[PDB]
Amino acid sequence: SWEVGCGAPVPLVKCDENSPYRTITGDCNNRRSPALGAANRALARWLPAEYEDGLALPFGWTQRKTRNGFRVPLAREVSNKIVGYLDEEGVLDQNRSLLFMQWGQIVDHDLDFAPETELGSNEHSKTQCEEYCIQGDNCFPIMFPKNDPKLKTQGKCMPFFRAGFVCPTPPYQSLAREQINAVTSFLDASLVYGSEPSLASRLRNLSSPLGLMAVNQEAWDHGLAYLPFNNKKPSPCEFINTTARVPCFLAGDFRASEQILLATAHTLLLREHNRLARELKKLNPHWNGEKLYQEARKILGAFIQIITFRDYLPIVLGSEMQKWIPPYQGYNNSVDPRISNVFTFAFRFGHMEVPSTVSRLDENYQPWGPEAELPLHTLFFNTWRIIKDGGIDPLVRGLLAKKSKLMNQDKMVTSELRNKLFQPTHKIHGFDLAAINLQRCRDHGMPGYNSWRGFCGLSQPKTLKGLQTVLKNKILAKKLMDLYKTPDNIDIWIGGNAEPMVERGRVGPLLACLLGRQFQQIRDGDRFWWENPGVFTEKQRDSLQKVSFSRLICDNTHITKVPLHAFQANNYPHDFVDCSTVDKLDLSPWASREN
Numbered sequence: 001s002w003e004v005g006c007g008a009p010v011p012l013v014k015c016d017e018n019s020p021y022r023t024i025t026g027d028c029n030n031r032r033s034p035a036l037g038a039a040n041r042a043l044a045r046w047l048p049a050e051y052e053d054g055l056a057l058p059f060g061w062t063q064r065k066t067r068n069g070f071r072v073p074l075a076r077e078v079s080n081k082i083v084g085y086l087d088e089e090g091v092l093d094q095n096r097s098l099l100f101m102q103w104g105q106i107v108d109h110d111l112d113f114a115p116e117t118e119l120g121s122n123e124h125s126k127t128q129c130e131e132y133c134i135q136g137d138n139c140f141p142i143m144f145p146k147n148d149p150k151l152k153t154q155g156k157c158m159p160f161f162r163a164g165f166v167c168p169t170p171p172y173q174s175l176a177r178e179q180i181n182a183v184t185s186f187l188d189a190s191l192v193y194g195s196e197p198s199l200a201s202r203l204r205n206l207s208s209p210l211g212l213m214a215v216n217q218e219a220w221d222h223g224l225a226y227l228p229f230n231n232k233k234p235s236p237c238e239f240i241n242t243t244a245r246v247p248c249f250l251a252g253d254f255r256a257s258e259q260i261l262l263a264t265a266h267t268l269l270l271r272e273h274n275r276l277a278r279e280l281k282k283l284n285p286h287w288n289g290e291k292l293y294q295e296a297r298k299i300l301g302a303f304i305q306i307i308t309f310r311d312y313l314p315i316v317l318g319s320e321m322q323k324w325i326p327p328y329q330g331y332n333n334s335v336d337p338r339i340s341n342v343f344t345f346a347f348r349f350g351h352m353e354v355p356s357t358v359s360r361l362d363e364n365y366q367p368w369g370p371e372a373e374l375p376l377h378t379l380f381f382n383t384w385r386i387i388k389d390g391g392i393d394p395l396v397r398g399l400l401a402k403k404s405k406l407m408n409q410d411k412m413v414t415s416e417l418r419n420k421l422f423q424p425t426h427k428i429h430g431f432d433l434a435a436i437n438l439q440r441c442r443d444h445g446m447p448g449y450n451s452w453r454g455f456c457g458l459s460q461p462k463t464l465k466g467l468q469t470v471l472k473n474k475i476l477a478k479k480l481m482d483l484y485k486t487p488d489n490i491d492i493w494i495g496g497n498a499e500p501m502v503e504r505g506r507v508g509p510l511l512a513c514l515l516g517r518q519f520q521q522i523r524d525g526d527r528f529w530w531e532n533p534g535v536f537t538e539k540q541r542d543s544l545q546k547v548s549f550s551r552l553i554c555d556n557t558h559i560t561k562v563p564l565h566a567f568q569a570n571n572y573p574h575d576f577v578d579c580s581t582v583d584k585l586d587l588s589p590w591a592s593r594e595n
């Protein structure tokens with residue numbers, strides 16, 4: 001087993017070891033090594049980090065140091081020549097609904113977080129980085145290339161701050177830099193409940209004994225709950241419209257209000273928890289507050305694992321699925337459940353799946369109002385469109401009836417994200433998610449594209465010709481070589497995403513390998529995997545299998561018509577059946593009798 005040797009993060013856990021419930025922090029999953037998988041620990045290294053100075057400085061930090069003999073190209077330049085595109089027509093995925101993209105972001109946030117080095121609300125360098133673009137300490141700005149139109153209109157660079165690492169916050173440490181994962185590595189709904197003791201508590205309704213999550217008191221959605229608002233007044237959600245003055249939502253994960261659809265999904269899960277608590281109180285009038293909380297919780301966690309492994313991964317991994325994820329043989333305590341550093345870049349393939357617009361549909365799945373179709377960028381940190389413009393039902397119908405954006409090698413990331421991204425700490429719509437992804441790739445000391453190809457037993461092109469055959473694209477290969485001068489230097493994020501998709505999947509060979517391995521490990525190394533004998537009863541498990549996102553919509557919204565397979569593309573009304581024709585969740589196996 002493993003756990004630590006330099007650790008400092010959450011204090012003071014002891015453990016029970018007879019407890020049938022996961023801890024909040026992730027500790028004590030593995031009995032041999034209690035900290036394996038816990039939040040606030042280093043992300044795992046499947047390969048040694050690769051920094052300019054070999055310890056902490058990212059490639060591209062020092063102007064005349066090379067990576068294997070060549071200058072690494074500016075992040076924003078790669079964004080401009082390879083990732084961008086203008087024409088949104090013919091870009092949609094004919095067989096993946098908007099929910100496909102959205103579930104990905106959910107699983108993701110449940111698995112990893114690498115927050116920025118924070119270092120003060122007192123600091124002036126938060127504007128020495130912003131206002132002047134001076135590289136230094138944890139300001140590692142994204143410079144604009146010449147001829148970039150943002151030069152003429154936004155300044156000389158885009159703010160950026162290196163991610164946090166273990167040990168500190170301020171200075172530095174001995175050995176090599178390791179970024180922190182602020183959330184638990186186990187699929188366990190930590191995005192609903194929180195990853196800290198702290199926060200998990202603030203989220204609960206501890207005045208009633210019903211094991212419920214606190215809800216909004218200021219507003220309701222046709223009698224259905226909304227997530228509570230957040231405290232911190234320099235609120236970004238208030239900024240995007242100081243007239244509506246509606247603050248961001250407060251959830252188990254801090255990014256829950258990043259974009260209106262992620263908040264919508266968070267809301268659906270909060271509602272499911274409260275609903276499972278009320279019905280559980282019905283079956284067992286004697287269970288106390290803690291017991292109701294933990295049980296509903298345990299439930300929701302299994303639900304997220306079931307939709308993820310049964311409905312989601314097969315249509316991501318395609319025919320590579322069984323090659324990486326075998327059928328389940330049981331808990332294996334030898335497996336390292338930790339999320340690796342590289343996974344957090346591989347799982348970013350989802351950014352190439354976000355379309356440029358979001359729609360609100362009415363009860364008939366017809367355009368909801370005048371302005372029903374909105375540009376994605378006006379929805380970053382937008383909570384007022386939910387509270388002051390229809391509830392979540394409009395938005396949920398769009399999730400089912402619209403499609404995701406299909407990855408394409410000539411159209412990669414939509415301009416709504418590539419030029420108009422809104423960062424919570426700054427004031428403009430005008431950031432580039434693609435460039436940021438690239439800069440972070442380097443901030444985290446990632447090995448290049450060929451190290452990972454090697455790692456996955458895949459060929460390593462060393463020439464233009466070789467790269468063309470792997471990418472099956474002459475022109476993209478030319479653009480990559482002109483910017484990188486050697487495939488060894490291709491940042492893993494762009495390289496992994498530039499590969500053609502595997503059969504029946506939505507990612508290429510490299511990514512399928514990286515994703516497949518990680519997912520096999522968090523299942524196999526999770527003592528509380530829903531299928532691990534003893535976690536649930538066979539009766540509960542039998543009951544556990546009829547879950548479906550569609551059902552979920554039926555019990556928690558006022559939508560009455562849903563598709564049966566929500567992840568594939570579905571046309572209204574042909575594919576939409578009546579909610580009462582959908583398998584329900586039979587709770588009877590949770591009934592406990594004293595004798």
Ligand code: HEM
Nearest residue numbers: 101104105108112113114259344347348350351354436440
């Ligand atoms: C706005 C953003 C999104 C949609 C409008 C969006 C979407 C996704 C999808 C669909 C993902 C996977 C299936 C996915 C994965 C990960 N993301 Fe995003 N994302 C939006 C915005 C961001 C921002 C901003 C970041 C931080 C970038 C940074 O480096 O500073 C971001 C991250 C991630 C992420 C890494 C998380 C971590 O481990 O720290 C993914 C796996 N997303 N996103």
Ligand SMILES: *[C@@H]1O[C@H](CO)[C@@H](O[C@@H]2O[C@H](CO)[C@@H](O[C@H]3O[C@H](CO)[C@@H](O)[C@H](O)[C@@H]3O)[C@H](O)[C@H]2NC(C)=O)[C@H](O)[C@H]1NC(C)=O
Nearest residue numbers: 094095096310311314315316504505564565566567568569
């Ligand atoms: C749109 O996506 C669909 C799923 O990605 C795809 O159909 C899927 O086809 C597979 C076979 O290739 C089927 O899978 C299952 O088949 C048997 C059914 O008895 C099951 O017992 C197995 O477990 C196996 O998983 C499914 O029938 C089907 N999946 C879904 C969600 O419907 C469609 O073909 C795609 N549409 C187009 C036109 O490409």
Ligand SMILES: *[C@@H]1O[C@H](CO)[C@@H](O[C@@H]2O[C@H](CO)[C@@H](O[C@H]3O[C@H](CO)[C@@H](O)[C@H](O)[C@@H]3O)[C@H](O)[C@H]2NC(C)=O)[C@H](O)[C@H]1NC(C)=O
Nearest residue numbers: 240241242243244245246370371378382384385387388389
């Ligand atoms: C900031 O948030 C405002 C909401 O607090 C928003 O204004 C609201 O949205 C429109 C304005 O275009 C109005 O909708 C329509 O309402 C009825 C239809 O039911 C009509 O009689 C009106 O003509 C109107 O078009 C909302 O009533 C309006 N609410 C308020 C208090 O003004 C702003 O548009 C938002 N601004 C930005 C920059 O996002």
Ligand SMILES: *[C@@H]1O[C@H](CO)[C@@H](O[C@@H]2O[C@H](CO)[C@@H](O)[C@H](O)[C@H]2NC(C)=O)[C@H](O)[C@H]1NC(C)=O
Nearest residue numbers: 204205206207208209210212213214215216217
């Ligand atoms: C905590 O849970 C209790 C219910 O157990 C909530 O109290 C109810 O609130 C609704 C709407 O305000 C009303 O039906 C009643 O006023 C309350 N019912 C009962 C039985 O007291 C309370 O609002 C919840 N608190 C939070 C912040 O979520």
Ligand SMILES: *[C@@H]1O[C@H](CO)[C@@H](O[C@H]2O[C@H](CO)[C@@H](O)[C@H](O)[C@H]2NC(C)=O)[C@H](O)[C@H]1NC(C)=O
Nearest residue numbers: 328329330331332333334335336520521524525
């Ligand atoms: C549990 O996972 C371990 C660790 O991955 C598996 O170990 C096998 O493969 C390892 C390579 O990753 C090597 O350590 C060994 O070849 C082998 N170890 C053992 C225990 O034989 C292991 O197969 C899994 N456990 C079981 C019983 O399936």
Ligand SMILES: [Ca+2]
Nearest residue numbers: 110184186190
């Ligand atoms: Ca988790």
